[PDB]
């Protein structure tokens, strides 16, 4: 649904460091929780902005498509950063930005990919994107993916605008790495990297999955959709 993104400094890296659980809805009415650890660091050599401890408000909205009969998600996300007192990148996002993500995937040797493409509104800190499973059916459920699958699209108030890494670090952007644990199951190990290549934000990933349960809620996909 709605989850705080913990951000602080990672100055022995020039990046950022994150922390978050995500509580995905089961469908016997539980909740499978998945623990996120991020690193985030610069690509370019370019002065970057490492901000005071901070957290994003994240908000997700999954759909389907009813013409779409490949496997796929629709997307609406909002983010605004919150939690501080009262760049050049920061251009790049003034008005409404193309989207491109590429996704590699290998969940317990079954591999997938997926293309997802949209468009982010920084400045109300707004993504719309509709995502595809480009090799069939995915083998886990769409929500455990959401994450991994733009974090310079954050909404960044005035008074905190000195704190926003993501978009300090661009046009040559940065790399994500996520450790992401699902309590009584398996783990993610994503890096993406994220920049603009023309005038497009385009995200690649590759991501491996390691551990999981074959009757578990991810393989058994019995996590809720929406």
């Not at 059916?137 to 905190?160: A, E, G, I, N």
Request: charged share 25%.
């Amino acid at each position: 649904n709605s989850h705080n993104v913990y951000i602080t400094a990672d100055k022995q890296k020039n990046g950022i460091k994150a922390n978050f659980k995500i509580r995905h809805n089961v469908e016997d009415g539980s909740v499978q929780l998945a623990d996120h650890y991020q690193q985030n660091t610069p690509i370019g050599d370019g002065p970057v902005l490492l901000p005071d401890n901070h957290y994003l408000s994240t908000q997700s909205v999954l759909s389907k498509d009813p013409n779409e009969k490949r496997d796929h998600m629709v997307l609406l996300e909002f983010v605004t950063a919150a939690g501080i007192t009262h760049s050049k990148g920061e251009e790049l996002f003034t008005g409404v930005v193309p989207i491109l993500v590429e996704l590699d995937g290998d969940v317990n040797g079954h591999k997938f990919s997926v293309r997802g493409e949209g468009e982010g509104d920084a400045t109300n800190g707004k993504l719309t994107l509709k995502f595809i499973c480009t090799t069939g059916k995915l083998p886990v459920p769409w929500p455990t993916l959401v994450t991994t699958l733009v974090q310079c699209f954050s909404r960044y108030p005035d008074h905190m605008k000195r704190h926003d890494f993501f978009k300090s670090a661009m046009p040559e952007g940065y790399v994500q790495e996520r450790t992401i644990s699902f309590k009584d199951d398996g783990t993610y190990k994503t890096r993406a990297e994220v920049k603009f290549e023309g005038d497009t934000l385009v995200n690649r990933i590759e991501l491996k999955g390691i551990d999981f349960k074959e009757d578990g809620n991810i393989l058994g996909h019995k996590l809720e959709y929406n």
